[PDB]
Amino acid sequence: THQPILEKLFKSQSMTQEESHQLFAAIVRGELEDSQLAAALISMKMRGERPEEIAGAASALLADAQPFPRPDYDFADIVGTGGDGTNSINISTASAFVAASCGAKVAKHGNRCDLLQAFGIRLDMSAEDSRQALDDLNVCFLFAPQYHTGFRHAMPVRQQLKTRTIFNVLGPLINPARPPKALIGVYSPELVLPIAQALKVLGYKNAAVVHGGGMDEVAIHTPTQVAELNNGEIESYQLSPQDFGLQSYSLNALQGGTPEENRDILARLLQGKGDAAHARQVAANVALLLKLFGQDNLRHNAQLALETIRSGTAFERVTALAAR
Amino acid sequence: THQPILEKLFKSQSMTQEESHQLFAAIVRGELEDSQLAAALISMKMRGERPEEIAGAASALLADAQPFPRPDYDFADIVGTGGDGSINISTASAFVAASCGAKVAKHGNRSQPLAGSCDLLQAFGIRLDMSAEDSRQALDDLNVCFLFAPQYHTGFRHAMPVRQQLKTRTIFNVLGPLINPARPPKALIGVYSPELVLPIAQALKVLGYKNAAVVHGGGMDEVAIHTPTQVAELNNGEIESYQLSPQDFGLQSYSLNALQGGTPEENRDILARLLQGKGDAAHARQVAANVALLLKLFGQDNLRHNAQLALETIRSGTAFERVTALAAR
Numbered sequence: 001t002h003q004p005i006l007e008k009l010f011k012s013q014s015m016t017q018e019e020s021h022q023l024f025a026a027i028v029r030g031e032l033e034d035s036q037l038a039a040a041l042i043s044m045k046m047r048g049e050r051p052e053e054i055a056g057a058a059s060a061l062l063a064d065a066q067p068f069p070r071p072d073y074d075f076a077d078i079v080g081t082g083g084d085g086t087n088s089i090n091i092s093t094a095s096a097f098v099a100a101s102c103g104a105k106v107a108k109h110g111n112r113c114d115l116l117q118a119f120g121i122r123l124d125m126s127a128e129d130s131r132q133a134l135d136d137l138n139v140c141f142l143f144a145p146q147y148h149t150g151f152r153h154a155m156p157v158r159q160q161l162k163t164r165t166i167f168n169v170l171g172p173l174i175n176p177a178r179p180p181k182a183l184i185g186v187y188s189p190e191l192v193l194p195i196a197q198a199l200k201v202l203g204y205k206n207a208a209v210v211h212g213g214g215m216d217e218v219a220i221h222t223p224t225q226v227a228e229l230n231n232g233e234i235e236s237y238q239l240s241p242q243d244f245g246l247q248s249y250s251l252n253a254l255q256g257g258t259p260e261e262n263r264d265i266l267a268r269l270l271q272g273k274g275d276a277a278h279a280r281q282v283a284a285n286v287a288l289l290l291k292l293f294g295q296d297n298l299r300h301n302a303q304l305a306l307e308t309i310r311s312g313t314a315f316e317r318v319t320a321l322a323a324r
Numbered sequence: 325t326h327q328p329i330l331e332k333l334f335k336s337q338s339m340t341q342e343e344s345h346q347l348f349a350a351i352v353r354g355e356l357e358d359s360q361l362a363a364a365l366i367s368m369k370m371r372g373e374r375p376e377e378i379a380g381a382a383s384a385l386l387a388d389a390q391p392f393p394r395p396d397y398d399f400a401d402i403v404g405t406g407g408d409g410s411i412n413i414s415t416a417s418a419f420v421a422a423s424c425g426a427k428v429a430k431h432g433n434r435s436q437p438l439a440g441s442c443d444l445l446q447a448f449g450i451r452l453d454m455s456a457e458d459s460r461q462a463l464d465d466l467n468v469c470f471l472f473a474p475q476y477h478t479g480f481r482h483a484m485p486v487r488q489q490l491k492t493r494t495i496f497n498v499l500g501p502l503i504n505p506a507r508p509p510k511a512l513i514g515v516y517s518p519e520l521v522l523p524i525a526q527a528l529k530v531l532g533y534k535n536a537a538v539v540h541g542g543g544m545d546e547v548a549i550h551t552p553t554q555v556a557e558l559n560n561g562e563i564e565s566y567q568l569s570p571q572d573f574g575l576q577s578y579s580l581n582a583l584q585g586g587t588p589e590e591n592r593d594i595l596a597r598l599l600q601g602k603g604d605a606a607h608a609r610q611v612a613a614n615v616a617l618l619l620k621l622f623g624q625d626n627l628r629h630n631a632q633l634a635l636e637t638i639r640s641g642t643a644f645e646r647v648t649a650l651a652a653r
Contacts, residue, residue, distance in 0.1 A: 010370065033358070033489045035359065035361070035362035035485075035486045035489045036362070036489060037359070038363045041363075042362075156359075163334050
């Protein structure tokens, strides 16, 4: 029984990391009544979740996660919380393949993947085969439902409440490969710093949390709020498209469509035949990701990302993964 | 769909009286999922319920309650919100006050139970599922009757499960005392916190009460005998607040421990020997103080005389004779 923890939440008091871990462990095991779960999520929502509580909940999910043979070499994740409802095109997947073509190791993780399916990539690839793909192709994809079997237990309540809760930010924090690096986008500017603070608690070494003009990614249409973890310290700052030596395009230039149309958009992009605005947005995101690997000149990183995209080399890497 | 209202609550925003009415009307009809109901209750709990929200909610609950042949003569209810953390003073007070000429139509819900009014009454052989007609007859003849919430508020079946699972006080604790189906013009209502005294008083005015007193004393939901009591009195559409002490009733102070209860069976015995004039002085004093304030709502302004009369009634044992009488109906 976690009544003492619930009563504490009802008093608008924050849980310790240990208490949060205890409570969420019970949740992802399906031990709470719908009423208790809803009460917990809403009480935390109205007060405002703290970094230690976020790390505690993420820790509980990671403790129950399916195994993954973690490599010793440097590697990163690139993912966003999702959040806007305008159906803008996915940017993280293209960025992963472009970065991988450069030699950066990307063990991408995400929950409902639609784009990757559209390209013949198997979402239920074994952890061993994904690790082999990471070794050989510098990229793999870990589908959340395959690794966090207990994540399902909160879905009904989350759908019934139809409001954002802590679960909306936990997905990007529970990569089963436990990467030392990560570029993570969030749906609001106020979540950037606390999430970066949670990543520190979770043991990440180099990471950047971002939000720009309403989007959970490095923005091409507005300034981007960043919180960068490095050498044990977190630095807050903003970036502008000009800092990458890139033109600033409208959010409307990134508009997506049906699943088939998005598939074609991404294919054209990675083949070096995409829209200029799409290529710039990917270039900006790959650029910041590479900063986590020690490449500090963002303008330089963006220019070379644009060259990698033009080469079309990233699309054959998609084909290569699909063959695994 | 009432999502817009839920989202407003989730933003820590207060609902208007009409928004609250619409939401609780849905709740008592089972239109909300356990998750939605729980979310609504906790969001209001953390923010602090406003009078307009309370009035709107109580209004929706009353709008769906079973009818009751309402008399035109003066009568009232005496009960508390609970959720304060003791023996039940309101039940003894109802029978003692009825013996002092006042009319009391007591309404209570399930505590499954333990030491709530309904639990104690049933123990005395009083039928909780008495017909509306029979209760009215008892109010006429014996100056007292009991209305069981589950009987008059059939929609609670949609709220009790979640309330039990949450195991924490919510707006339902403050709504309970406000949904008497006989809708009496007067009432003495105890609340679990001082900050709730004014808003509840304001809500009573909206519900149409003519003379009422909302009280809180030393952490208890009633007129205290171990500490000062905060009061908000509604009269002539106007509210006024002041403090009372045991001395204002011409009574001695007692420690809160003096009102400590025991097992369900022991609480029943405590109440029985009290009404029989063979009880604890501290308990008699507490009942006397609560009865005294209740009688003030009926026009008896001398609290000291009121209390004296209540004490005499208790020692006479006639109040338990009244319990026996109701147990025969």
